[PDB]
Amino acid sequence: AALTEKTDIFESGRNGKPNKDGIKSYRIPALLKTDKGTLIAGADERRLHSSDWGDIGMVIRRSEDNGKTWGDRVTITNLRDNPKASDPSIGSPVNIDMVLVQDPETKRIFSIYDMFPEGKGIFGMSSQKEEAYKKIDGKTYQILYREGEKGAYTIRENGTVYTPDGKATDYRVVVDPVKPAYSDKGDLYKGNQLLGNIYFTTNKTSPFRIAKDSYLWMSYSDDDGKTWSAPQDITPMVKADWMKFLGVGPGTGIVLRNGPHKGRILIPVYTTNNVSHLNGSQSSRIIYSDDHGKTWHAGEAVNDNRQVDGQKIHSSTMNNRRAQNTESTVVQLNNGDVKLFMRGLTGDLQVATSKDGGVTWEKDIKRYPQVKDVYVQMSAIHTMHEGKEYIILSNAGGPKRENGMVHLARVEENGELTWLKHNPIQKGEFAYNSLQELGNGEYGILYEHTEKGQNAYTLSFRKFNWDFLS
Ligand SMILES: [Cl-]
Ligand SMILES: [Cl-]
């Protein structure tokens, strides 16, 4: 066989029950082959149910034998639940959806993922804007709102809470968490007494909360994924004042390997606006770093100044369901161009092109009727075989989220894509997935599937070779 049997990396419970570890659900795979040869498999650990909210931790497992066996779960981040929440299913600050990538110069490994305070995830965002940050004297601070008060408190040096007028208080935020899984992050103290947590939004025991908005956090590892930094809040570097949601397109990001922007880290993200939010404004873009992950910047949206049937749209003002593009996967070609394969609503594969290292996008989105898109996440990777350039892309074959496929395209000298093969890899339920090159003509994939009553989803791994592809 040219495809290995299914190995289950993150096992969900069955028939609506928790698994042996008390966890009902895993979702949202990310797969990363590191410079040491290690495979890191990431996921949402969704304890209480399968929905995009609740008690969710960012977790990884490591394989040191190319996916044959796997080590213990390592929790990158898991924010503590609000013990007073009326409904535990929506009673925790939330992390959800990660992107993994390694810097090939520094060997640092990044996991970038979404964060929401307590509530129904994205559906817990305030209906009206709540400002999340304020710049005071050239310094950007996260805002806190106090019960019964209108003004903006700020979290400054060492987590000290300042009044809206600019005076220090005896309140302090845990900004340098030290507990396992960093479960103490956001804890709110008055002197030495723990009062609550700034991410709690109901039945609060402390006076302070952050804006009910959408955030982006990053954790990094310098030891091949064994241990992880405390979360860094990168939101203010990349989130514009008009953006409602800003979140990752989960999977595995890339580092540009050629051209004037060689070394740039690219992370797929997408946004919504306040005009049409999730109904008509989901828009793909990337964020990037040119300094090995220290600072981040937003590129333009594919939808910015995009002409749709003779009239331009902009990601900040659009209201057009079919012009949306959401979670995406990013690839650089040998000619230096960046290709962004975007989940969307045309039924087929949508691809944007950037000639400037991901910052701006060409006028036209290219569609490939040869590859179905049933409106679900996908992953794609660059690969060379026998001196020829290809892209491998995996997603559901359909008609529903089912029949996982690995699609093989030749990259032409145009550089257009020619779809050569469409190979089934998993019968039955199939959703989010993440591909990696393993070396020696082999490839790995971590993907969502269920069978035999499993809760959505169990994340499984398979390896295949060139023979399987071609
Ligand atoms: Cl609280
Ligand atoms: Cl239009």
Author numbering: 321 to 790
Tell me what the authors wrote about this structure, in their words.
Streptococcus pneumoniae genomes encode three sialidases, NanA, NanB and NanC, which are key virulence factors that remove sialic acids from various glycoconjugates.
CNanA and NanI share 41% sequence identity and the r.m.s.d. between 413 Cα atoms is 1.26 Å. The two monomers in the asymmetric unit are related by a noncrystallographic twofold axis, superimpose with an r.m.s.d. of 0.39 Å over 470 Cα atoms and bury ∼1200 Å2 of surface at their dimer interface. The active site contains the usual catalytic residues common to all sialidases: three arginines (Arg347, Arg663, Arg721) that interact with the carboxylate group of sialic acid, a nucleophilic tyrosine (Tyr752) that is proposed to form a covalent intermediate and its associated glutamic acid (Glu647), an aspartic acid (Asp372) that acts as an acid/base and a hydrophobic pocket that accommodates the acetamidomethyl group of sialic acid.
